[PDB]
Amino acid sequence: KILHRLLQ
Amino acid sequence: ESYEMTAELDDLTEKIRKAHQETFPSLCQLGKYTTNSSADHRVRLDLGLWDKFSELATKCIIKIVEFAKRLPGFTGLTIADQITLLKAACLDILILRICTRYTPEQDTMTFSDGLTLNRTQMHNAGFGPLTDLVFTFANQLLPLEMDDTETGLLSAICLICGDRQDLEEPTKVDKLQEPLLEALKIYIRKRRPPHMFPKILMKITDLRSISAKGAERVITLKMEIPGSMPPLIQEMLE
Numbered sequence: 197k198i199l200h201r202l203l204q
Numbered sequence: 205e206s207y208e209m210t211a212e213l214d215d216l217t218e219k220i221r222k223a224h225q226e227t228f229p230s231l232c233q234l235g236k237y238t239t240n241s242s243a244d245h246r247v248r249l250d251l252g253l254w255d256k257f258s259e260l261a262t263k264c265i266i267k268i269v270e271f272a273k274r275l276p277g278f279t280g281l282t283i284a285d286q287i288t289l290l291k292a293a294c295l296d297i298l299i300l301r302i303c304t305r306y307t308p309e310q311d312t313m314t315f316s317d318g319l320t321l322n323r324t325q326m327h328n329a330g331f332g333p334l335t336d337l338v339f340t341f342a343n344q345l346l347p348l349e350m351d352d353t354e355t356g357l358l359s360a361i362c363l364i365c366g367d368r369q370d371l372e373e374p375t376k377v378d379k380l381q382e383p384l385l386e387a388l389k390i391y392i393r394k395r396r397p398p399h400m401f402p403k404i405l406m407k408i409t410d411l412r413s414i415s416a417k418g419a420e421r422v423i424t425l426k427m428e429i430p431g432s433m434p435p436l437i438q439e440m441l442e
C-alpha cells in the first residue's frame with residue numbers, strides 16, 4: 197500500500 | 205486587551221502553523237501562471253487539464269500525509285487509525301486548501317505549482333458538477349479572514365476525528381483533538397477581537413457536504429479518464 201509506506 | 209497565560213497551547217499552535225505553511229505554499233509566495241487548455245467553454249473533461257490536475261492532486265495528498273505526521277501525537281496512534289483518519293479527511297483538507305488559493309476578483313484558484321485556473325477550467329480539469337459547490341465555499345470563506353495558522357488547525361481538527369468509523373482507539377483520537385479545538389479557540393480570541401470560533405467550526409460541516417459528493421465524482425471520473433485513477437487518489441477516495 198502507498199499509505200503504509202508513506203506513513204512507515 | 206488582556207489574555208490569560210497559555211504557554212503549551214501556544215507551542216502546539218506554532219507547530220501546526222509551521223506544519224501547514226511548510227506543506228502548503230502561500231498564494232502570494234507563489235509564482236502564478238496561466239494555461240488555456242479550454243478556458244472558453246465547459247466540456248465533459250479536458251484530458252490535458254486532467255493529466256496536470258491529477259498530477260498536482262497526487263502531490264498535494266502526499267503533502268497532506270506529510271502534514272499529518274507533523275501533528276503532535278498523530279504518529280503515536282496505530283497505523284490502521286492513521287490510515288483511517290487520512291482516508292476520511294483527505295478530501296475535506298483538499299477542498300479547504302484549494303479554496304484558500306481563491307482569488308475572488310479573477311475568480312480563479314491556484315495550485316501549488318502556480319497553475320491558476322478559472323471556473324470553467326476547474327470544471328474541465330475534473331470538478332465537473334462540483335465546481336460551483338467548491339467556489340461557493342471559497343467565497344463563504346473570505347469573510348472569515350483565516351490565516352495559515354487557522355487553516356492548519358482547522359485541517360488538523362478535521363483530520364484527528366474520533367467519530368470516524370473503524371477507529372480502534374477513538375478515545376485516543378478524541379484526546380488529541382481537544383487541544384486543537386482549544387488552541388483554535390484561544391487563537392481566534394487574541395487575533396479576532398469575537399464570535400468566530402463556532403462560525404469557523406461550522407465550516408467543517410460545510411466541507412462534509414462537499415466531500416460527500418466528491419466521493420461520487422471519483423466513480424464518474426473513472427468511466428471518463430483514459431487509464432486508471434492515480435493510485436494514491438484511489439487509496440484516499442475508495
Ligand SMILES: CC1=C(/C=C/C(C)=C\C=C\C(C)=C\C(=O)O)C(C)(C)CCC1
Binds near residue numbers: 257317
Ligand atoms: C483528488 C480529487 C478531487 C479533488 C481535489 C481537490 C478538492 C483539491 C485539490 C487541490 C490541489 C491539487 C491543490 C494544490 O496543488 O495546491 C475531485 C473531487 C475533483 C475528483 C478527483 C480526485
